[PDB]
Amino acid sequence: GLQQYYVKLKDNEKNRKLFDLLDVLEFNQVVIFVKSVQRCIALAQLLVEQNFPAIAIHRGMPQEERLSRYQQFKDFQRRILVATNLFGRGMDIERVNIAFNYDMPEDSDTYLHRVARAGRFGTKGLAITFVSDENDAKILNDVQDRFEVNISELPEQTR
């Protein structure tokens, strides 16, 4: 179903909110998107230290390396994937039950493509996006105005 929500907070509150949501929310596999390779690597490192089996897969990584790492995610050796973007298919993230946009996507098309992938084939799940500046808010409105998708503040048949 990929229920979509957003949280408006300062960027320096993101780790705090992220950590909070991960213990309170029920989840099997999760994917978290960040805007840069540096943030991708660091966030995964922070999570692992917090005893969260996370792994980073980012642009620049050789096709074979991405798959080896993603394979670990698929076999549940890692339950949290931190990525900079979606890659080809096979990178079937529709398996996740939660998708976080730690950093708001660059634009509304990217945002839709991500929820479409995390919810591919109409699979169920939750989508949570962090809004930290007026640019992020603008994009959020773009998604709602352009696609008429329902995104509210965080408080079989097609899903």
Side-chain angles (χ1 to χ4, degrees), residues 35-119:
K35 65 182 175 189
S36 72
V37 175
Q38 291 183 68
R39 291 164 79 76
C40 190
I41 297 172
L43 182 54
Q45 302 176 322
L46 278 183
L47 292 175
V48 168
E49 184 165 56
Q50 297 299 287
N51 294 65
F52 283 113
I55 183 170
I57 297 184
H58 62 253
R59 46 172 155 276
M61 280 197 164
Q63 212 313 77
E64 172 184 286
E65 170 170 43
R66 301 198 303 267
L67 296 189
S68 174
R69 296 207 174 200
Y70 188 69
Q71 189 55 63
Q72 298 179 56
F73 181 64
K74 291 183 61 182
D75 303 326
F76 300 91
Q77 302 305 287
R78 288 305 190 182
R79 293 212 307 291
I80 299 171
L81 166 61
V82 184
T84 49
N85 55 282
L86 302 174
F87 293 81
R89 291 197 173 185
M91 185 71 88
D92 50 17
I93 53 169
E94 55 257 48
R95 66 183 64 268
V96 309
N97 40 211
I98 306 174
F100 292 84
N101 275 314
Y102 180 85
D103 290 316
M104 175 70 233
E106 19 292 296
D107 60 23
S108 56
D109 286 321
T110 295
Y111 175 95
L112 183 61
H113 184 59
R114 288 180 179 180
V115 298
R117 267 294 204 77

Side-chain angles (χ1 to χ4, degrees), residues 117-129:
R117 267 294 204 77
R120 192 136 120 78
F121 301 110
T123 50
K124 48 186 187 299
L126 191 60
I128 301 175
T129 299

